[PDB]
């Protein structure tokens, strides 16, 4: 069938920038092309068809161009709510095929994370396994460093991190680091801390708690 190749696979740009995404088909598709936008957590919604014909209610900052096998989607003035994956689609032939997608992220000013630490409840303690949670809330850029400290020694073997998708209003991220231990190991130690370094922080921030 017709192969659709999108470029770039990812991009980041500031609000108000002009960004361009390209789609190359393995053969000519005679302008039978659509562009779709998929916001985080949502179904895709079509921006335009016939490569350049905008759908009702689609903001004018979106435009399409191209011919033959080569097409482009331009966002003239990226907005904070434009965080999304964008897909091209050909409907020249069956089967319908889509491009691989282009993830669009927003560049914005540095924002320091708000750091919180959550000691396990004692239901957790009764369970056999304990999870200590460190939350980095509403920060930019995505890159951050989280160190776990157990009575002052570093414990990084049994932690795992998860990061939200970029927020569609303030363009920040949030991150969880979860340290998983046995109950006997957890109750054999005394103070637990998470230490966060980020571009927005003048000095590393450490949040701590005393077991018991």
């Amino acid at each position: 069938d017709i192969q659709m190749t999108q470029s770039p696979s990812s991009l980041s740009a500031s609000v108000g920038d002009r960004v361009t995404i390209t789609c190359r088909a393995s053969q000519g598709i005679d302008n039978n092309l659509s562009w779709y936008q998929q916001k985080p957590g949502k179904a895709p919604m079509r921006l335009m068809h016939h490569s350049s014909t905008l759908e009702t209610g689609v903001p004018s900052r979106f435009s399409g161009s191209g011919s033959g096998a080569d097409y482009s989607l331009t966002i003239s003035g990226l907005q904070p709510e434009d965080v999304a994956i964008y897909y091209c689609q050909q409907y020249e032939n069956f089967p319908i095929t889509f491009g691989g997608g282009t993830k669009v992220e927003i560049k914005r000013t540095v924002a320091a994370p708000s750091v919180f630490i959550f000691p396990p409840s004692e239901d957790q303690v009764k369970s056999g396994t304990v999870s200590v949670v460190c939350l980095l809330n509403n920060f930019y850029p995505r890159e951050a460093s989280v160190k776990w400290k157990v009575d002052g020694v570093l414990k990084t073997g049994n932690s795992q991190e998860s990061v939200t998708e970029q927020d569609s209003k303030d363009n920040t991220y949030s991150l969880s680091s979860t340290l998983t231990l046995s109950n006997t190991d957890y109750q054999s130690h005394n103070v637990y801390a998470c230490e966060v370094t980020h571009q927005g922080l003048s000095s590393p921030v450490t949040k701590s708690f005393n077991r018991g």
Binding site: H50, Y91, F94
Partner: peptide, 8 residues
């Protein structure tokens, strides 16, 4: 064309 581009 096919799909949304089909013609009858």
């Amino acid at each position: 064309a096919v799909g949304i581009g089909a013609v009858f």
